[PDB]
Amino acid sequence: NYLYRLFRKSNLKPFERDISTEIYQAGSTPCNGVEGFNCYFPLQ
């Protein structure tokens, strides 16, 4: 029901509310979207 951000590019500033949910590159793979291998959806 409730989702939490696990994968984020950088840490938040105090009282920042950043709610973009775009799937993006974590590792070596040059992609956005294309979830799998080394690109992931940010929340669980």
Next chain:
Amino acid sequence: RFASVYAWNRKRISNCVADYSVLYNSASFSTFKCYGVSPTKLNDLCFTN
């Protein structure tokens, strides 16, 4: 060659440089999982064994 089902693959690695980043980044694995943080973040860290 890997440990049979009657043995666990337990191969001590010591006194060396650990390229944790390539293990994560490489496409040769079918899947990768880690308990803590990705090997690219562990890439410049020191461990016991």
